[model samples]
Target: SCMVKFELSSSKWHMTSPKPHCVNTTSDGKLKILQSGTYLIYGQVIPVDKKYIKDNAPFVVQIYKKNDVLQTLMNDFQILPIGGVYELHAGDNIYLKFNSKDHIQKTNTYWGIILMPDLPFIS
Candidate 1:
């Protein structure tokens, strides 16, 4: 189920699984980990009509432990995210990008991860 990456992030492209970008659920995914390494995951999260970044749409990047979106352990990224990420501490921080262009709205634009380096993400 892995090795076929789909590009996640919009502003940035994170090819997870091979499709470059694809999924069928909201925050519900997983990773088979065909390979392991240090990975920095991120996504573009903008508010509906684009009012979250003060004319500069932000993003919300969540670093998970697996491919399961429901398994969201925590989140990085910033308000009106131009681009940023969470430093893999100890455990492997999986990737899941998305553009929730709705700080006050709710329109999901999701993505996936392909972290490299096998860096340890400690909690």
Candidate 2:
């Protein structure tokens, strides 16, 4: 489901089928949170030019979770997120999106993330 996407072309980050054909039930456009445990929520940007200085575009990515009410992965965006570590129980969800105020060229921008499920130690 990948096609050399550009950044800022859409308001949301695009979610595709997981590589290696593994399963993780969360979605940028899904119905529920699939698995829950400690997670490392992290994301990075891919500039169309492959370097910010070459075609630098300003943007911000955010993570969200649901409790009694929806909550932020970091309460708020900061210089660096809290290592993407989160203790989400089953039904707790996460999402990532970006906002680039300037126009992003069709071939000059892409950004997304993959959630790494923390493996618990065996007792």
RMSD of each: 9.3, 8.4
**Over the full model, what C-alpha lDDT does candidate 2 score relative to the true structure?**
0.38
The digit string of per-residue lDDT tens for model 1 on 1-123 reads 222222233233334443422222223343433333334344334334432345444444444455434323223333333223433333343544444423422234444443444446888
Minimal lDDT window, size 10, model 2: 74-83
The number of the candidate with the highest TM-score is 2
| Backbone collision tally, model 1 | 43
Score residue 63 of candidate 1 by CA lDDT.
43
TM-score each candidate.
Answer: 0.32, 0.39
* Angstrom error at residue 120, model 2: 7.6
> How big is the RMSD of model 1?
9.3
Across 1-123, the per-residue lDDT of candidate 2 in tens digits comes to 221111334533345543312223332332234544444444333322224333444444445565343323321223333224555565654444445433224333343334454457778
TM-score, structure 1 vs. true: 0.32
Q: Over 4 Å off in model 2, which ranges?
A: 1-31, 47-58, 67-83, 101-123
